[PDB]
Amino acid sequence: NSIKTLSNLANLLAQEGKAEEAIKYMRKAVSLDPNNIKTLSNLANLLAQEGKAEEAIKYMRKAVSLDPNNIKTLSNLAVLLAQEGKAEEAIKYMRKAVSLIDKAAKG
Amino acid sequence: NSIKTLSNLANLLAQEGKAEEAIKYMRKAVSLDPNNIKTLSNLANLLAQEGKAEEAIKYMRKAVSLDPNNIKTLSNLAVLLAQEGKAEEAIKYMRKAVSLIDKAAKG
C-alpha cells in the first residue's frame, strides 16, 4: 500500500521536524488517489500545523465537497476554520454536522 | 519520546491487522501520561475501530472531562457517539462545540 507507506513516512518526518519533506510525501499520497478523503484530510492537517492555513482550508474544503454529508469531514473543517481565526465561517459547517446528526437520530 | 514510539508501533500493528497488540501498546502510551488528551483520543478511536464501542466512548468521554471546552475533543466524541448509534447523545456534544465556536466568534 503506497498511500499507507507514504503516509507513514510523512508522519515520521513530521514527528521529527522535517515537515516540509512530510508535506511532499503527503502530496504524493494524494496524487496516488486524489479522491481519498482521509488522505486529503491528513494533508490539510499537516499543512495547517506548518502554517499553511489557506492551503489547509482549501484541502479540507475539497474533502468536504467530495462527501458533503460526512460529519467527520464537516467537523474537521469547522475545527480547522475555528483554530485559524475564522469562527464565523466555521460555525455553519459544525451546524450542518449537528443537523445531520439530528437527521440520524430521527432515522 | 516513549509515548511517540508506542503510538507509532500501535499504528503500525493496527495497519497490519494486529490491533489487539496495538491496543496494548496504546494503553501503555496512556499509562505513561494518563492526562494526555491526544493519547486518550487515539486509544478511543482504536478501541472503536476494533468493536470495543463502550470502552471507546468511556475513553473519549474522559478526554472531554479533562478539557471540557475543547472543540476538537467534543466533536470527536460526537462523531464517535453518532457512528455507534447514539446520535441523540451525540448531538448535545456537537451543539456544545457549536456554542463554543459561537463564543469564539463573539470574542
Author numbering:
A (entry chain A), B (entry chain A): 1 to 107
Q: What does the paper behind this entry write?
A:
One of these highly populated repetitive folds is the αα-solenoid (SCOP a.118), whose most widespread superfamily is the tetratricopeptide repeat (TPR; a.118.8). The ﬁrst crystal structure of a TPR domain showed that the repeat units are helical hairpins, stacked into a continuous, right-handed superhelical architecture with an inner groove that mediates the interaction with target proteins. Here we show that such hairpins are detectable and that one of them, from the ribosomal protein RPS20, can be customized to yield a TPR fold by repetition, with only a small number of point mutations that are neutral for the parent organism. We concatenated three copies of RPS20-hhta as an initial construct, connected by the TPR consensus loop sequence (DPNN).
M4NΔC is M4N without stop helix. We conclude that in the amplified constructs, the observed interactions are more favorable than the interaction with the native stop helix, releasing it and rendering it prone to degradation. This led us to ask whether this helix is in fact dispensable. Indeed, an M4NΔC construct, which terminates with the B3 helix, showed the same stability and dimerization as M4N. We obtained two structures for M4NΔC from different crystal forms at 2.0 Å and 1.7 Å resolution, respectively, the first (CF I) with two dimers in the ASU and the second (CF II) with a single chain in the ASU, for which we constructed the dimer by crystallographic symmetry. (a) Two dimers in the ASU of M4NΔC CF I. (b) Dimer constructed by applying the crystallographic symmetry to the single chain in the ASU of M4NΔC CF II. All three dimers superimpose to the M4N dimer with Cα RMSD below 1.9 Å.
